[PDB]
Design a protein around this nucleic acid. Sequence first.
RNA 1: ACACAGAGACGCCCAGA
RNA 2: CUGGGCGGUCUUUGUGU
Length: 1575
Amino acid sequence: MNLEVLCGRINVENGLSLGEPGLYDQIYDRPGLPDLDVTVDATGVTVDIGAVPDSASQLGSSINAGLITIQLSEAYKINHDFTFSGLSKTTDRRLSEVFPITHDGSDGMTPAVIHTRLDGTIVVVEFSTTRSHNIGGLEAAYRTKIEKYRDPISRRVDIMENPRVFFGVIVVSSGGVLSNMPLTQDEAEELMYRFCIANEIYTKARSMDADIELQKSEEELEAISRALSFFSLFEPNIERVEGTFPNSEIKMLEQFLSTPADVDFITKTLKAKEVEAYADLCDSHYLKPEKTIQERLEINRCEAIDKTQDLLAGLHARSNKQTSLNRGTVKLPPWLPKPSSESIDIKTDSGFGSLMDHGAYGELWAKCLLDVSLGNVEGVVSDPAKELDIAISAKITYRRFKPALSSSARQEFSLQGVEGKKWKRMAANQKKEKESHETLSPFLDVEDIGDFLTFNNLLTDSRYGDESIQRAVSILLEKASAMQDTELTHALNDSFKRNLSSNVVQWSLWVSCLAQELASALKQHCRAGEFIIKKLKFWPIYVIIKPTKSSSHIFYSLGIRKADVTRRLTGRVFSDTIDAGEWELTEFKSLKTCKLTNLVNLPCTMLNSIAFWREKLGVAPWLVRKPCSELREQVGLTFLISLEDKSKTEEIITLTRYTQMEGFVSPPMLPKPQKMLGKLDGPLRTKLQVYLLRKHLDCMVRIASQPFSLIPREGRVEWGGTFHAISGRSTNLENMVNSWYIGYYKNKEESTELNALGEMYKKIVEMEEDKPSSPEFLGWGDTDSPKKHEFSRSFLRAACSSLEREIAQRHGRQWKQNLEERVLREIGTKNILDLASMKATSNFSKDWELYSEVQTKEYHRSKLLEKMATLIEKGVMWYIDAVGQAWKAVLDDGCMRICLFKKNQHGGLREIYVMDANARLVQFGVETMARCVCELSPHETVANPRLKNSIIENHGLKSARSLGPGSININSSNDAKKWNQGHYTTKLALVLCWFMPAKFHRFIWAAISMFRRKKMMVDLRFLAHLSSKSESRSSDPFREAMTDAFHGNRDVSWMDKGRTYIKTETGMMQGILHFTSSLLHSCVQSFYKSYFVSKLKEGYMGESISGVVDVIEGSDDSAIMISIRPKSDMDEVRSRFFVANLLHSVKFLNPLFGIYSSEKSTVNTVYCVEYNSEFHFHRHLVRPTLRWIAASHQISETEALASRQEDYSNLLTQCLEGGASFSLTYLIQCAQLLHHYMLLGLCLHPLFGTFMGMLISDPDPALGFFLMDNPAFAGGAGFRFNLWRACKTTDLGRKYAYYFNEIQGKGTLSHSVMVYWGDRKKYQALLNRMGLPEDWVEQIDENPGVLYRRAANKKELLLKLAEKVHSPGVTSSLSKGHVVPRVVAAGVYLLSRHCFRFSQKASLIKLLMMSSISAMKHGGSLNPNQERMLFPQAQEYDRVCTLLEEVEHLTGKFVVRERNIVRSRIDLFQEPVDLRCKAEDLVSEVWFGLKRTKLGPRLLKEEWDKLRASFAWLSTDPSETLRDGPFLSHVQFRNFIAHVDAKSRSVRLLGAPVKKVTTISQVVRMNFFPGFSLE
RNA sequence: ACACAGAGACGCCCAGA
RNA sequence: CUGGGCGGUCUUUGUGU
Ligand SMILES: O=c1ccn([C@@H]2O[C@H](COP(=O)(O)NP(=O)(O)OP(=O)(O)O)[C@@H](O)[C@H]2O)c(=O)[nH]1
Ligand SMILES: [Mg+2]
Ligand SMILES: [Mg+2]
């Protein structure tokens, strides 16, 4: 409104008060844009501003009708003028008028507004206009303007006696205002409206006049030029497209675009679906005849009980019907030996011969111990002296023995799989193999598992506090905490050590040691009848090991003396052992590579589980309490899930989320958890699965009996009656939500056997059989009862029109013209090198079609970067130059080549499709187009990540403004069933071509046509076993169908005789058409929004219901939010019934668009909505922190030793942002320290105590020392902050200063201790197939501009390709799966073998000795110059470091937990602010004349002079840079100038609202522990 | 023991017996 | 049926935040 009243709200303090930006988004309902008639002449542009439509929102009232005219010299600034016309009309005032005159070159420039407040306080206001829909453009414009006007203003501040001043920047976009001023929402909405009108005017003027727009850079000009030339000269040969792919006639698209939607058909179908939905609701929820809620809930309970009994009977009928079983859940002994020193004690008082009379295992162990006593000890335990001799200045030694076992013993061992392939044809082996396939009865007695869960001794103190392993961990933790020695640190460390002395953790320690030994032994081989004997390092446990190979089972048997078992884990979930005379033995059990990662990570996992679940129960870390039943149940369930590690066990717990979401369903609807009974069917094979299924069904019946009570408490809504799904114990909502993710403790990366492959094929074939016979309802005509894969043309056009109307409301008319230019830009600028990646591409082709001539060959997937390099070799520069050849090859092939595999995920079974290079090239442009359209949609979240959050909290503001206080919010959280396989791609092509100009249409219709003939290669090993079995005897009809199709006994459409592939016409693939499907679902949600708004307007008896409707949607995942304000009690129930019917009708309206509603959808919940596993329970956002906590050890292979701590810091930050307190984050980091030291050889190397006690003297993260975070702010700051803190307090800074002096004479140094996995063999082969020159570095030294320019010729493209392959991203990308076992297998030789490389290879002990030798010449401290070179944010680090020194003690109080949990952002390390622009653009613009900045020559020279000061070796000549700097290569200099521009570190925190050093202190004092205030 | 409403794995490659 | 060879081995990881 007024210029002055906006400044009046601004508060000024002391000198230059700046503040922080605050984003405003479009929340209010806009009126229609006024009609604008534009005319141009040489005297200017005249616009006839029309009549603004008058709504009740008052928005846009400043827009008045007129014939205003702007001259043809500021015609490029209407967006800057009309947006701010009415807020800057106060003449012009330069800096020198109202500031002291300092004779620099900045005198003459003028800001937008300089208000004087008429009393002696100067406030300066700057305006900015951006056309970027993304929030990044707003931030870029804001930072550019504030950097342009910060330094001169700050200079003029210090020349005044009392400079009470304020600087503000206001940036306006299409759907966002970035301003640091207290500006109200109405003014922001007015700014968006003015921007929209100005942008429409400017686009209308530009579309008929070339010279209005300023001259764009010629790179952009050539980009749109080449894109337009391609799209206007691209002939897809539509005749061949129609003749090749089914249902690819362009007449379909012509009729879809030209024929308007049938209105009468739409209304009739809508009314029919309304009637059907009402009937379904009344039938399923017992609404008629009228009954109160008690009888309805009782009928629901009886129905749930009947359906549960039906499922149980059906499962029991297909099982072995055995009600009693002896099968342990934990296949490891419950032994808890007291850990001792390193020695072999096999002294049997009764002799080894007494072991011989105790069965096959007794005979085996007697012969093993006899061979050990009468043989060399070398091999049972690793030799310390040999490794000391090797380390002070590869081959693997294991003690192997060959027992002469009897035939009965060999038969018994073969029954367990030990050499079981030889004994396959024996009768007992055949009977065991037959019986192993049978399933378990649901009525099997599993009360022992419940007894273990309720009553266990897992959390009892083992009293092993002062044993060698925990002393080692204590020494390492103490040395890590010596740099942060506070009382609070001591309390949290004591809590960690108390958790370490627990029984379950002590058990898991030796279990992890055994798993590490097995992972090491997986690379060995043994002959027939030969075994390996090993002894665990810290425990008196002996292991007999039978290896087969690395990709198959590893067998092990355990043995201990009966006097060495100090205690045991109580419970009957453990497998039965063998009781010899004085020895306890274990039967042979098997493991794989994928099964070892849970056993290795078991101790840290259980420590994290204990800490997390004791925090969620409310007991502080510094308090000691006896465990309760809930803590024991949660910890024991985590224990059993970790040790079980099976997919079905995970799935049963995972489905409890959707089972328990039904308890939030509100009247008149009833909770319906029995809908999840379909997904609970399937074979049961373990007792834990049976127990979990029975508990799940009990929870289902209990929830169907009674919903969660909704309790209004003051102005906030809570829920009562929540409980754990498995335990059944009552708990709060947070613990119930977190307990849905206990199944995530199962290994995501589970290996897929051949047996399990065909079922994944079943997921693809079973949808192709449902293909419609006729294509009439595949895009041609209209149907009211669509079948599978079918949809209505009129409804599709109506949804497209609804989304087009909403897009025109948001971005204004002529939006398609702007979309055209942006699409042309994105297509033209991007080059073929940008598609090069280390991600697999398919090699399936015509040569692989017949199994007859490929039965001996072996198939592998190559990498996309190799094909990109092959294209670059042929002089291919731009992607759009290769689209034509790719499409021609695709059309000549006549199909689309795909190869399949199985995804490793925590949600069940899903397949993954990999395309070849040509299909990738053709699909990329379509996906770019669809992304550009989706970025225009105001409720599509895949392309707009902010919309994931903002719509939900802004719905409350919409409701408050439109209805007033006291509005009821009803939500539906929807899921789509079979999203990718359900969508016939003609629909997607029509939807995409609706939002494009016709010039792109012929491409889009062609490129999507190839999806209607997909040839997907199956695994060749699967066909090798399928070929030899002509007849199938399975009970799954798909197995007979595939066999008969392959052998030719049955004719099917998807498979032919003797082929390596399946054929698919319907559906799309996983995420290949992600953005196009998101656009389709956006159209559908816009149609639903308009339909619901019209239904609310018409009412149920002729008066409108006051309501606000919001929709949010992603790929297939969506939610609907409706707020209504009733005017009475009867009106309330009628309006709620009406809204419930509206939300229920979505399931029936979805098939008209080809979308099928999944049963996981939760409909009609009040004050509750879940969108992306982000649970909003009224004003309380709930995040499942356990989900991120269970993945805090999922590391990647890092060649550098200091990158492991970076990965740990990333995982710790992910845990912190998930909703964990700082003390929990510190305990998780303690577990991470234990994991890191275990992976270095703590339990596998004898030379660790020497390594530990001699690494104490040199705490270097490069050499393996773990830096621990500050407990009051754990996880907030990165690894570099801890490195900088260690440089300023520990003697590491002295070492770094000495190394810097050494490199000066004649972070960066932390990565100088490296290990090469497989000595870069395959990586080297990757360079031996391209023909890339080795002169690349010298050639780019000759031409540094290649590093800062897009492209000039194929030689430069080869140069940047060679730079790309010689990057850490390519290097750290060939690592395969199962990172933890492969990494820990190197922990047996890492310390004392020559494998480490230093910036000749040496050992870690050798490197530490050399560092200690050089540690006597260390002098002084680290220099301020390198204190800014190595740590650009170090000063910023300082303002955090001094802000944590006032929180040092464990003082505080337990306050009442005020629950208003929201998500907030904290900027702890901001952008480095001395230089206005980045150095990457600053150097490039001067050196090569590239307009990468927005500064004039004077400002550019000023920033150049500022860049001079810090580095001091910088030179204007690149040759002088080459011969005047430490960086010998331009590659290193480019990385240096990229990294010296430091990043801004921000943390997303979950907790009480933050009112913006104050924020950091507030979250430290609050988020240390829930319900506790620090100091 | 692993996988599985029985599709696999429980070693693979050679040289001579 | 005797002496041997076997790891970044292959399986294995796609499209978007
Ligand atoms: O890993 C992934 C997960 C999801 N997606 C994309 O997200 C879509 C839905 O992913 P989804 O997890 O919802 N599974 P869906 O196919 O809907 O069947 P259902 O289990 O019954 O719900 C899929 O169809 C893909 O398009 C991927 O592309 N990759
Ligand atoms: Mg959902
Ligand atoms: Mg889905």
